[PDB]
Design a protein around this ligand. Structure first.
Ligand SMILES: *[C@@H]1O[C@H](CO)[C@@H](O[C@@H]2O[C@H](CO)[C@@H](O[C@@H]3O[C@H](CO)[C@@H](O)[C@H](O)[C@@H]3O)[C@H](O)[C@H]2NC(C)=O)[C@H](O)[C@H]1NC(C)=O
Ligand SMILES: *[C@@H]1O[C@H](CO)[C@@H](O[C@@H]2O[C@H](CO)[C@@H](O[C@@H]3O[C@H](CO)[C@@H](O)[C@H](O)[C@@H]3O)[C@H](O)[C@H]2NC(C)=O)[C@H](O)[C@H]1NC(C)=O
Ligand SMILES: *[C@@H]1O[C@H](CO)[C@@H](O[C@@H]2O[C@H](CO)[C@@H](O[C@@H]3O[C@H](CO)[C@@H](O)[C@H](O)[C@@H]3O)[C@H](O)[C@H]2NC(C)=O)[C@H](O)[C@H]1NC(C)=O
Ligand SMILES: CO[C@]1(C(=O)O)C[C@H](O)[C@@H](NC(C)=O)[C@H]([C@H](O)[C@H](O)CN)O1
Ligand SMILES: CO[C@]1(C(=O)O)C[C@H](O)[C@@H](NC(C)=O)[C@H]([C@H](O)[C@H](O)CN)O1
Ligand SMILES: CO[C@]1(C(=O)O)C[C@H](O)[C@@H](NC(C)=O)[C@H]([C@H](O)[C@H](O)CN)O1
Ligand SMILES: *[C@@H]1O[C@H](CO)[C@@H](O)[C@H](O)[C@H]1NC(C)=O
Ligand SMILES: *[C@@H]1O[C@H](CO)[C@@H](O)[C@H](O)[C@H]1NC(C)=O
Ligand SMILES: *[C@@H]1O[C@H](CO)[C@@H](O)[C@H](O)[C@H]1NC(C)=O
Ligand SMILES: *[C@@H]1O[C@H](CO)[C@@H](O)[C@H](O)[C@H]1NC(C)=O
Ligand SMILES: *[C@@H]1O[C@H](CO)[C@@H](O)[C@H](O)[C@H]1NC(C)=O
Ligand SMILES: *[C@@H]1O[C@H](CO)[C@@H](O)[C@H](O)[C@H]1NC(C)=O
Ligand SMILES: *[C@@H]1O[C@H](CO)[C@@H](O)[C@H](O)[C@H]1NC(C)=O
Ligand SMILES: *[C@@H]1O[C@H](CO)[C@@H](O)[C@H](O)[C@H]1NC(C)=O
Ligand SMILES: *[C@@H]1O[C@H](CO)[C@@H](O)[C@H](O)[C@H]1NC(C)=O
Ligand SMILES: *[C@@H]1O[C@H](CO)[C@@H](O)[C@H](O)[C@H]1NC(C)=O
Ligand SMILES: *[C@@H]1O[C@H](CO)[C@@H](O)[C@H](O)[C@H]1NC(C)=O
Ligand SMILES: *[C@@H]1O[C@H](CO)[C@@H](O)[C@H](O)[C@H]1NC(C)=O
Lengths: 328, 175, 328, 175, 328, 175
């Protein structure tokens, strides 16, 4: 080997691991605060405060709700034929035309909201024997009286309101949404003055369905000078089907159809400011980053967003246990 | 944790080790020195990043859903709309809570494991030439200069080269 | 160092762990019966059998359902202005006044049940031209005829039933629940005898909504001497809104409003005895202790309760594996 | 379990050990004895209580919910009310079943671990003076009276004090 | 002791584990492709393509939907008194009798679908003063006119339609389902021609409930020569209760009751072929084997089936890590 | 994995071992051989089958449920019918993904464990007569013919029989 290898000394080698002065407490199966070298937060808990206007198409409703934009309240005429990925409804929105109510408001707002388009096609309905284009002073269009842009208020011509019986075929290859309505007068006098018959009736049908609504006379609360109301209804007509509108008084007739589509559109109630930035996840509190897996900003989301969770902090250990060598 | 190296037979960490997560300090002929071990540091780091990326893998996207805030009192249907969401939230919250608990538990045993594996690897290598002092330090029973310490660390140490020197020093003595 | 230890002997040290004669089988990732030293049960599977009357406010409905207590069936007059955290409805409950039906009984029972109060405020409705306070012998109040305490049956005065058109403003700062109804006569004769007009009509509205119900004449099955029915409806009036009740016959008028609140109240169907004890979790089978995390007593709960689970036993190992030394 | 001490290299437990979960039995110059080890017993117990308390942490409370029992046949809405609850129950049942399975699996490896850690600790301490008989017993190659057995147990044993005695007894012999 | 005699040498023993040339990648907590010796698939992702006709009782609806089989459209008379565990409705089904609509079609299809029986009992209703058994040429039964087998169209006798007021007690110990309906005429002339009264009315009630429907006159779209429609309704009568049918015109009367039961029956829309084989799990795509825990074939299932999952493959490692000698 | 035997101190597997999952390879003065170890192979296999059967335990059965495909647009109630199912599917998908991840992770550490337990068992048995070469091979310092190799494998090896031969060969030499 060598010869008498005599140098009898020794050495010491010690294995160890790092430790940090600071350190973060995390939960475990067996402990709920154990300190580790480092951790990362898995709950997103803060919004920017603004709804980024990119990548989704945000449509700010300003002071129109979606249904008033749909019906064509004069003040919402800005929205005709408009489209959106997300329609934001503001708390300040107001209606300002003939007082109306929508029996299943919630389904009509939904059904339009996810169709994502207000594209309207006017069709040539011929109403013989009635006066078209009725309006009201509660729905001022400019200086004059007016009514919803997408609806057509029929009243008597001379001394008679005939039985209207019209039909409109769906010859296209898409579904057609028709919004129509009925006028509920305040007085039997109002009824006969406008529609002659003392009891109106509206029946709208297809090969598949039918709705017959009869009006209801009575005073409701004064809203914009009126005690009458109109109630809104809808009928979808499938390709190849046919719409038949049959009435004897009180019909608020459709002027054509909204076309329906299938997409990722929805509606959101938010007063957050829209701003220019790209963000995939929208919350009524403004956009939030979807880098973390869970979020605690709001349970309402649109887009690629973290899963809402009750916790506001969940730290994932990304290091060993911290066992400090003093602590400085 | 499960292996009892970290916060176990190794009394505490070195706040001074800044160049890696696991490593060596020696005291020899030329003096005392410290060195991070980069293979076990990378093994530990890669596993924690692997774990990390799996958790941040795809936020799924959702568009039109159901209403979750209501302004009027409606009864039966609104009660169900509320109940569907409240039970969805509690289930996702349970999931998040359990996930970080399992994950964190495992990250502590994984890092405890890598410490212990580095120890075992060094033990195996020194063969009959060193003894375990039991606190994560080996007593090397032969003259081992800095190049000797570096060959242990970089994994090229030849035990045979020092075996008779070490065995003499370690056993013979006077008993 | 030391001197001649003449004797040089050895010793034996052995490490081991305990074991118990008994032992409990638990499930594992890899085994489904492995025996451990000890375990603890995580499923609560037994009730006391009694609903503890503390800490929640239990209201025992005795032989009144919540809706009859609301309407004011004579026999439920005990409950006027009552309140509860949990209203317990008993299987033995019975109605015993004018036969009625509630179109969406399930929402009205819910809506009242979580409001948690039957506080009634009478308001000064003035019904001019009709006879108030009609009652029936099927709703005996004491020796006499009677009707629901909270409703007011209007019939003609002399030879006329006018068009009633009344209004009641919500000037307070809380929502008001109004319960009203309509009488469906058995015969056209009954209709004209009571309400003169051969076809009644009730329209109740606010600025936001309206309901017009018209009665339906026809014989239903004899219930407490009667073939007529009254159907119950409800209208909530928000602060600042206004109620307008307009009718021409068949109205069963409200006497005022129930006030609504927001709380933790609910209703439960149970025949379990109420008893004095404190228990947070209530099940229709009686209270159960919420010390364990899961329970298998009933999927209906109220209060701080364990999560209902299909399993009836789940043992959590609280000890090592049992490896005993004798045979079996 | 994972370490193979319990129900592994240690053939079976002692039904007679009533004073702790892990411990020692010896035979030395002065007779035979048994003694529980309280540090590993407390380590094992504390971890299982930690686990236990996390599982019994907060029953959340729920007040008005949806109806879960019906007396009439109604169709579409009641079908959904039933489906929401049935899918909620199966999900919570899955959760409970998986939770105790993971938990229990871990409790057996945790306790297997503490047994093996106690063994390793005692090994390290006896240094070159004892040999592992492989059944969880060490053969101590030097005269070790009761106070010597006590110093191993309470962790103050000095191997140097007996090293030449032990090394002589253990190696030299006749080969 | 043991005496070597002469030889002096050593041996080498090495422990190792197997490895396979092939190997399967699986996901882990820390890796998402790590290669193991072997794995097993947990997601069932393929159907046989056929609905096995065993063990459940599959009833193929051929060109009848469940509701037409229920009402008794001539062409569905094959199904009278039929029963099923699963009724399969085919996309090709068609109706071919008097045009009708069912207000809550979805609940009636459900309610019948899980009752699982079309057992019909005829009861002796006596209709005095009206002409029974009306039929139509749009519902041809054989060469002649016809109508739904389970319904009875009443029209005037001579010059009068009386007020019908009939009753049928539930004296049995099971619930009775009664399907009845109302005819909506196209013209006021049709109304008076058939039912004399210019406004019909149908009220069907029990001790517990009542429905009064009034018809609606108007033209709907021509369907099989007709613009009239009949709308279908249902009433369940509990044991001890009583049905009272009261009408004054337009009633399409029940001929008796369907009996209801409680079972595991349901309905499925599928064009898959029924075939002979035993399979517990049915999917609208055909049966699938329930050996794996999760499936990705379809979210609609009937029977003992795997839990539907978005993933189409999930491999469970059933072997150690593969560390081969050469490569992979 | 956690023990660092497989894909750890044991460099790679033997594609040639076809008769079991874990085993031995030897080289002595009589020849070379290979033999599977059947006890550790059965231990590993039984645990993985245990795990497997628990996962395939009972598909629960469901009959009438809610509609999950619609042909008309209806609004509020159909939105909820869709939302109930979509949140049920994502929750069951989360469950499946997490389940195979935990499971697979554990199967790799379990098999790593059995490898290391076989190693430790063999170590314990050879006592002072062999040294660990550190790559999962022991160097046996005494003449060990094929019956000797068989007794180590079948667990009947008597270390005492060769202790003086081995201790001489292993230590004495010339240092
Ligand atoms: C039926 O009863 C209701 C409630 O009493 C009557 O409604 C009230 O009718 C008056 C007269 O039209 C309304 O007056 C107007 O109020 C506005 C705002 O204050 C004011 O600008 C006008 O000068 C006028 O005073 C009153 O607001 C209205 N109130 C409600 C709550 O609707 C209704 O007229 C009665 N109808 C019949 C036919 O008897
Ligand atoms: C329409 O048809 C129904 C059913 O046939 C008639 O109902 C029945 O009317 C009679 C006479 O009022 C009821 O008699 C009562 O029986 C009880 C005992 O149950 C007795 O205490 C009373 O003094 C009286 O005799 C009978 O119960 C009742 N049955 C049902 C099921 O309602 C109804 O009267 C007919 N109406 C007209 C206007 O034709
Ligand atoms: C109310 O208006 C509707 C729509 O204009 C009228 O419906 C149409 O009525 C005609 C005459 O009955 C139907 O014609 C028939 O069609 C069949 C199939 O082509 C054919 O066999 C007959 O020879 C005849 O042409 C037409 O199909 C029908 N269209 C629709 C969409 O229903 C209805 O008649 C009007 N009613 C009244 C009372 O004015
Ligand atoms: C009060 O005067 C007005 C109005 O609203 O301004 C004038 C308007 O030209 C007239 N429109 C038509 C088509 O008749 C209406 C309606 O008669 C009422 O609104 C019925 N409630 O009344
Ligand atoms: C049968 O006699 C009574 C009754 O019920 O006791 C007498 C009672 O004073 C009378 N009440 C009024 C206000 O008219 C009622 C109703 O006329 C009927 O119930 C209508 N179905 O009838
Ligand atoms: C058109 O002729 C028929 C028909 O349908 O074949 C002749 C048939 O005997 C007659 N049935 C009765 C009971 O009146 C019906 C109905 O009058 C109409 O369908 C009312 N829409 O009309
Ligand atoms: C803590 O962990 C996160 C995620 O691994 C990482 O980005 C961060 O840099 C870590 N901190 C340090 C000081 O290493
Ligand atoms: C809306 O779009 C349709 C389809 O191109 C068009 O014909 C119509 O005139 C448009 N109207 C407005 C107001 O943009
Ligand atoms: C988000 O918005 C809701 C309702 O607007 C509010 O209660 C919540 O605290 C907000 N959270 C954050 C992070 O802004
Ligand atoms: C290991 O260390 C010794 C001393 O520095 C050196 O000669 C040798 O080449 C090193 N080997 C490697 C692979 O770094
Ligand atoms: C079994 O475990 C439970 C929970 O840890 C504990 O209360 C009980 O005392 C234990 N039993 C024994 C005998 O230690
Ligand atoms: C119910 O409470 C209200 C509000 O204090 C009170 O005015 C009313 O008279 C009470 N009535 C009864 C019967 O207690
Ligand atoms: C609880 O009550 C339900 C219904 O009353 C019953 O089926 C169930 O078995 C009961 N369970 C217990 C533990 O009482
Ligand atoms: C350990 O044991 C020895 C003998 O009993 C005793 O002298 C010593 O002080 C003990 N130390 C401790 C810390 O118990
Ligand atoms: C792979 O695993 C499955 C399930 O354990 C088993 O049936 C199959 O035989 C295994 N493959 C091999 C080659 O062992
Ligand atoms: C249907 O079954 C009932 C009950 O046995 C029987 O009376 C009736 O005549 C059956 N009708 C047909 C068409 O099978
Ligand atoms: C099953 O059927 C659905 C709808 O018919 C189809 O989209 C899906 O891809 C099919 N999957 C398989 C495995 O057949
Ligand atoms: C172990 O191996 C030796 C040599 O083959 C043999 O004599 C002995 O009986 C074997 N024992 C067992 C249990 O196989």
């Amino acid at each position: 080997q060598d010869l008498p290898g005599n140098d009898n000394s020794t050495a010491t080698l010690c294995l160890g691991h790092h430790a940090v002065p600071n350190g973060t407490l995390v939960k475990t199966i067996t402990d709920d605060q154990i300190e580790v070298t480092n951790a990362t937060e898995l709950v997103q808990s803060s919004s920017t405060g603004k709804i980024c206007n990119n990548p989704h198409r945000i449509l700010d409703g300003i002071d129109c709700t979606l249904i008033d934009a749909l019906l064509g309240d004069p003040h919402c005429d800005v929205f005709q034929n408009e489209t959106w990925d997300l329609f934001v409804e503001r708390s300040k929105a107001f209606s300002n035309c003939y007082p109306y109510d929508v029996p299943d408001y919630a389904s009509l707002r939904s059904l339009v909201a996810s169709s994502g388009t207000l594209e309207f096609i006017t069709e040539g309905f011929t109403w013989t024997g009635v006066t078209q284009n009725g309006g009201s002073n509660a729905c001022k269009r400019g200086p004059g009286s007016g009514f919803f842009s997408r609806l057509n208020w029929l009243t008597k011509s001379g001394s008679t309101y005939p039985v209207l019986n019209v039909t409109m075929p769906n010859n296209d290859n898409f579904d057609k949404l028709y919004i129509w309505g009925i006028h509920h007068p305040s007085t039997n006098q109002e009824q006969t003055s406008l529609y002659v018959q003392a009891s109106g009736r509206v029946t709208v049908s297809t090969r598949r369905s039918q709705q017959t609504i009869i009006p209801n006379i009575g005073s409701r609360p004064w809203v914009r000078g009126l005690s009458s109301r109109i109630s809104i209804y809808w009928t979808i007509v499938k390709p190849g089907d046919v719409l038949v509108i049959n009435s004897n008084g009180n019909l608020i007739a459709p002027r054509g159809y909204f076309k329906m589509r299938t997409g990722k559109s929805s509606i959101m109630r938010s007063d957050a400011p829209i701003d220019t930035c790209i963000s995939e996840c929208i919350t009524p509190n403004g956009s939030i980053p979807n880098d973390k897996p869970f979020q605690n900003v709001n349970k309402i989301t649109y887009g690629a967003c973290p899963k809402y969770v009750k916790q506001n902090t969940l730290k994932l250990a990304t290091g060993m246990r911290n066992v400090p060598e003093k602590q400085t | 944790g499960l292996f009892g190296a970290i916060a176990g037979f190794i009394e505490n960490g070195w706040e001074g080790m800044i160049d890696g997560w696991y490593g060596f300090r020696h005291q020899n002929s030329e003096g005392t020195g410290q060195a991070a071990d980069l293979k076990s540091t990378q093994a530990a780091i890669d596993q924690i990043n692997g774990k990390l990326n799996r958790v941040i893998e795809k936020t799924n996207e959702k568009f039109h859903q159901i209403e979750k805030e209501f302004s009027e009192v409606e009864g039966r249907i609104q009660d169900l709309e509320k109940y569907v969401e409240d039970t969805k939230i509690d289930l996702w919250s349970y999931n998040a809570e359990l996930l970080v608990a399992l994950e964190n538990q495992h990250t502590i045993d994984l890092t405890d494991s890598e410490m212990n594996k580095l120890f075992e690897k060094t033990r195996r290598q020194l063969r009959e030439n060193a003894e375990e002092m039991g606190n994560g330090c080996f007593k090397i029973y032969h003259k081992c200069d800095n190049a000797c310490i570096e060959s242990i660390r970089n994994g090229t140490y030849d035990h045979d080269v020092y075996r008779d020197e070490a065995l003499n020093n370690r056993f013979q003595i006077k008993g």
